[PDB]
Design a protein around this motif. Structure first.
Motif, PDB file in Angstrom:
ATOM      1  N   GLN A 192      20.817  44.310  86.343  1.00  0.00           N
ATOM      2  CA  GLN A 192      21.298  44.021  87.491  1.00  0.00           C
ATOM      3  C   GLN A 192      23.043  42.936  87.257  1.00  0.00           C
ATOM      4  O   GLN A 192      22.866  41.451  87.026  1.00  0.00           O
ATOM      5  N   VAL A 193      23.719  44.363  88.007  1.00  0.00           N
ATOM      6  CA  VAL A 193      25.494  42.981  87.735  1.00  0.00           C
ATOM      7  C   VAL A 193      26.056  43.660  89.234  1.00  0.00           C
ATOM      8  O   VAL A 193      25.708  43.884  90.329  1.00  0.00           O
ATOM      9  N   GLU A 194      27.190  42.371  89.487  1.00  0.00           N
ATOM     10  CA  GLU A 194      28.059  42.500  90.612  1.00  0.00           C
ATOM     11  C   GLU A 194      28.566  43.838  90.600  1.00  0.00           C
ATOM     12  O   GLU A 194      28.585  44.369  89.568  1.00  0.00           O
ATOM     13  N   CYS A 195      28.490  44.906  91.985  1.00  0.00           N
ATOM     14  CA  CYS A 195      28.784  46.310  92.000  1.00  0.00           C
ATOM     15  C   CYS A 195      29.274  46.707  93.210  1.00  0.00           C
ATOM     16  O   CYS A 195      28.709  46.604  94.129  1.00  0.00           O
ATOM     17  N   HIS A 196      30.200  47.581  93.071  1.00  0.00           N
ATOM     18  CA  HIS A 196      31.241  47.437  94.574  1.00  0.00           C
ATOM     19  C   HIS A 196      32.397  48.041  94.588  1.00  0.00           C
ATOM     20  O   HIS A 196      33.246  47.869  93.035  1.00  0.00           O
ATOM     21  N   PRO A 197      33.384  48.206  95.744  1.00  0.00           N
ATOM     22  CA  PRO A 197      34.601  48.999  95.538  1.00  0.00           C
ATOM     23  C   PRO A 197      35.538  48.196  94.781  1.00  0.00           C
ATOM     24  O   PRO A 197      36.723  49.000  94.321  1.00  0.00           O
ATOM     25  N   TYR A 198      35.492  46.848  94.775  1.00  0.00           N
ATOM     26  CA  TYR A 198      36.507  46.367  94.020  1.00  0.00           C
ATOM     27  C   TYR A 198      35.889  45.750  92.521  1.00  0.00           C
ATOM     28  O   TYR A 198      37.038  45.786  91.965  1.00  0.00           O
ATOM     29  N   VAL A 216      22.034  48.029  88.791  1.00  0.00           N
ATOM     30  CA  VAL A 216      21.701  47.841  90.102  1.00  0.00           C
ATOM     31  C   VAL A 216      22.623  47.038  90.515  1.00  0.00           C
ATOM     32  O   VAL A 216      23.149  45.701  90.044  1.00  0.00           O
ATOM     33  N   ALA A 217      22.858  47.218  91.717  1.00  0.00           N
ATOM     34  CA  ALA A 217      24.396  46.559  91.987  1.00  0.00           C
ATOM     35  C   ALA A 217      24.360  45.450  93.355  1.00  0.00           C
ATOM     36  O   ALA A 217      23.356  45.688  94.298  1.00  0.00           O
ATOM     37  N   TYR A 218      24.437  43.772  93.006  1.00  0.00           N
ATOM     38  CA  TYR A 218      24.893  43.281  93.629  1.00  0.00           C
ATOM     39  C   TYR A 218      26.013  42.466  94.363  1.00  0.00           C
ATOM     40  O   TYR A 218      26.989  43.293  93.657  1.00  0.00           O
ATOM     41  N   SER A 219      26.167  42.209  95.319  1.00  0.00           N
ATOM     42  CA  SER A 219      26.735  41.935  96.092  1.00  0.00           C
ATOM     43  C   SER A 219      27.560  42.953  96.444  1.00  0.00           C
ATOM     44  O   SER A 219      28.942  43.081  97.137  1.00  0.00           O
ATOM     45  N   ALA A 220      26.996  44.571  96.914  1.00  0.00           N
ATOM     46  CA  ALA A 220      27.835  45.394  96.919  1.00  0.00           C
ATOM     47  C   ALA A 220      28.563  45.499  97.920  1.00  0.00           C
ATOM     48  O   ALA A 220      29.138  46.888  98.429  1.00  0.00           O
ATOM     49  N   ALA A 258      29.841  51.275 101.816  1.00  0.00           N
ATOM     50  CA  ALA A 258      30.296  50.818 100.440  1.00  0.00           C
ATOM     51  C   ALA A 258      28.715  50.812  99.415  1.00  0.00           C
ATOM     52  O   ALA A 258      28.468  51.874  98.984  1.00  0.00           O
ATOM     53  N   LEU A 259      27.585  50.590 100.958  1.00  0.00           N
ATOM     54  CA  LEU A 259      25.777  50.870 100.343  1.00  0.00           C
ATOM     55  C   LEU A 259      25.565  52.458  99.631  1.00  0.00           C
ATOM     56  O   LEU A 259      25.365  52.908  99.135  1.00  0.00           O
ATOM     57  N   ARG A 260      27.326  53.489 100.563  1.00  0.00           N
ATOM     58  CA  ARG A 260      26.898  55.078 100.326  1.00  0.00           C
ATOM     59  C   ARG A 260      27.018  55.510  99.165  1.00  0.00           C
ATOM     60  O   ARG A 260      26.853  56.481  98.423  1.00  0.00           O
ATOM     61  N   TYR A 261      27.831  54.485  98.710  1.00  0.00           N
ATOM     62  CA  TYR A 261      29.055  55.400  97.761  1.00  0.00           C
ATOM     63  C   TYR A 261      28.501  55.082  96.489  1.00  0.00           C
ATOM     64  O   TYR A 261      28.167  55.662  95.338  1.00  0.00           O
ATOM     65  N   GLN A 262      27.727  54.133  96.231  1.00  0.00           N
ATOM     66  CA  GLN A 262      26.994  53.557  95.000  1.00  0.00           C
ATOM     67  C   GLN A 262      25.588  54.911  95.261  1.00  0.00           C
ATOM     68  O   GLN A 262      25.308  54.463  93.952  1.00  0.00           O
ATOM     69  N   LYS A 296      36.042  59.885  95.623  1.00  0.00           N
ATOM     70  CA  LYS A 296      37.615  59.815  94.872  1.00  0.00           C
ATOM     71  C   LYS A 296      38.068  58.424  95.122  1.00  0.00           C
ATOM     72  O   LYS A 296      38.955  57.183  94.882  1.00  0.00           O
ATOM     73  N   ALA A 297      38.341  58.401  96.758  1.00  0.00           N
ATOM     74  CA  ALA A 297      39.393  57.440  97.780  1.00  0.00           C
ATOM     75  C   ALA A 297      38.347  56.267  97.117  1.00  0.00           C
ATOM     76  O   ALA A 297      39.051  54.914  97.152  1.00  0.00           O
ATOM     77  N   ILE A 298      37.123  55.876  97.223  1.00  0.00           N
ATOM     78  CA  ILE A 298      36.555  54.736  96.898  1.00  0.00           C
ATOM     79  C   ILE A 298      37.097  54.553  95.216  1.00  0.00           C
ATOM     80  O   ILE A 298      36.997  53.368  95.388  1.00  0.00           O
ATOM     81  N   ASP A 299      36.540  55.368  94.296  1.00  0.00           N
ATOM     82  CA  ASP A 299      37.276  54.806  93.649  1.00  0.00           C
ATOM     83  C   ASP A 299      38.275  54.633  93.154  1.00  0.00           C
ATOM     84  O   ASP A 299      38.550  53.293  92.777  1.00  0.00           O
ATOM     85  N   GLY A 300      39.257  54.969  93.925  1.00  0.00           N
ATOM     86  CA  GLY A 300      40.476  53.923  94.002  1.00  0.00           C
ATOM     87  C   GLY A 300      40.917  52.843  95.089  1.00  0.00           C
ATOM     88  O   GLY A 300      41.698  52.258  93.976  1.00  0.00           O
ATOM     89  N   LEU A 301      39.489  52.172  94.806  1.00  0.00           N
ATOM     90  CA  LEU A 301      39.700  50.882  95.556  1.00  0.00           C
ATOM     91  C   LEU A 301      39.551  50.053  94.010  1.00  0.00           C
ATOM     92  O   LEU A 301      40.065  48.813  94.627  1.00  0.00           O
TER      93      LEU A 301
END
Ligand SMILES: NC(=O)c1ccc[n+]([C@@H]2O[C@H](COP(=O)([O-])OP(=O)(O)OC[C@H]3O[C@@H](n4cnc5c(N)ncnc54)[C@H](OP(=O)(O)O)[C@@H]3O)[C@@H](O)[C@H]2O)c1
Ligand SMILES: CC(=O)[C@H]1CC[C@H]2[C@@H]3CCC4=CC(=O)CC[C@]4(C)[C@H]3CC[C@]12C
Length: 325
Positions: A192-198, A216-220, A258-262, A296-301
């Motif tokens: 479980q680690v920090e994970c989000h589009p940034y 498992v993404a926290y601060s998503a 952001a949630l759906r991307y994960q 792809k767009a979200i990966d680009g963030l």
């Protein structure tokens, strides 16, 4: 409503199943810890089946009461709740692992956790203080072999006190240390680690995938942004213009994007909210899908924004965030 008996889950490497949307329970110091009770009840009511907490969050009494209350009133069965706790760094010594789990379970008044994690890989001196400091204000770090801590985790799983065991805030090196350990009995089910589009963690995610470890993404949603833990001039994830544009297109919200991307990249995603409307909203992640060009767009963030550096624990070699990944 049409069918609440089923929900989306992923198979872990120990044969247990983790629901892919988890409810985050941490709240900042100004919020009374009594507020966790109502929020977890609302989450369960809204269709959350995975609930994430920790000894450190000082909410396990309330979280446990909420779960037991929703079982006692017929809303949900124990087997349809996936509850996670975490071992705090003042209990890494192997002799202290089971006592810390038993203490969590006693606060929760539950017979087992579904998942127990090593919270953070930097050990501190044992005792009642969660962050022990010397006369100079300096954190008293402890030298502990996490391989021995893991052995103690495995024995918790063998005793049935944790159905699954995993890790949190581990980097590549630390994961490999556990995976290559002499006499390994159970791989960690998750990291479980920090994970989000940034900070999309693609390198660490692919390493986990290659080992059938679930990230498992926290601060998503961009984190609680609590000072001094998060810098107030870090960019606000949910104001991102690509996320906001996608949300408008889909008639959703940036949070939902952001949630759906994960979910679509095979991550299990946590989302904390103590607000009834937002708790309900977050469960809409299962109602829409993103196209490949949207993904792809979200990966680009991706832009190397780590909200939670936890640099109060920097220095020792197990500090996980100085390595590339
Ligand atoms: N393993 C670890 O070290 C570690 C570290 C950090 C966190 N975690 C876990 O992961 C959880 C989540 O992370 P986080 O606490 O950083 O928060 P997060 O989930 O990223 O969310 C941050 C904020 O988003 C808001 N929010 C929720 N839904 C929203 C929506 N639909 N629209 C707009 N805003 C929304 C929340 O406010 P409202 O409440 O007001 O809705 C909250 O302030 C924690 O609670 C904890 O369980 C673990
Ligand atoms: C979940 C999370 O972000 C973690 C990262 C650092 C953690 C904090 C670290 C310092 C701390 C010390 C305490 O005595 C109470 C809990 C707190 C206030 C922790 C709350 C949970 C935090 C904020």
């Amino acid at each position: 409503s049409v069918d609440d008996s089923k929900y989306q889950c992923v198979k872990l490497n120990d044969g247990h199943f983790m629901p892919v949307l988890g409810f985050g329970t941490y709240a900042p110091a100004e919020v009374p810890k009594s507020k966790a009770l109502e929020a977890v009840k609302l989450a369960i009511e809204a269709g959350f089946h995975h609930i994430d907490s920790a000894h450190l969050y000082n909410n396990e009494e309330q979280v446990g009461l909420a779960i037991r209350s929703k079982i006692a009133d017929g809303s949900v069965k124990r087997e349809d709740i996936f509850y996670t706790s975490k071992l705090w760094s003042n209990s890494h010594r192997p002799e202290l692992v089971r006592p810390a789990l038993e203490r969590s379970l006693k606060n929760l008044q539950l017979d087992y956790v579904d998942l127990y994690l090593i919270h953070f890989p930097v050990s501190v001196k044992p005792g009642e203080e969660v962050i022990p400091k010397d006369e100079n204000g300096k954190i008293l770090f402890d030298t502990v072999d996490l391989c021995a801590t893991w052995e103690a985790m495995e024995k918790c799983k063998d005793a049935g006190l944790a159905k699954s065991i995993g890790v949190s805030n581990f980097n590549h090196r630390l994961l490999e240390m556990i995976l290559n350990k002499p006499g390994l009995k159970y791989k960690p089910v998750c990291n479980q680690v920090e994970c989000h589009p940034y900070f999309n963690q693609r390198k660490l995610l692919d390493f986990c995938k290659s080992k059938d470890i679930v990230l498992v993404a926290y601060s998503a949603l961009g984190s609680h942004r609590e000072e001094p833990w998060v810098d107030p001039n870090s960019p606000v994830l949910l104001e991102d213009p690509v996320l906001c544009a996608l949300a408008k297109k889909h008639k959703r919200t940036p949070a939902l994007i952001a949630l759906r991307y994960q979910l679509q990249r095979g991550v299990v995603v946590l989302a904390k909210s103590y607000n009834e409307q937002r708790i309900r909203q977050n469960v809409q992640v299962f109602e829409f899908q993103l196209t490949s060009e949207e993904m792809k767009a979200i990966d680009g963030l991706n832009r190397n924004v780590r909200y939670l550096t936890l640099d109060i624990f920097a220095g020792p070699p197990n500090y996980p965030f100085s390595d590339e990944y």
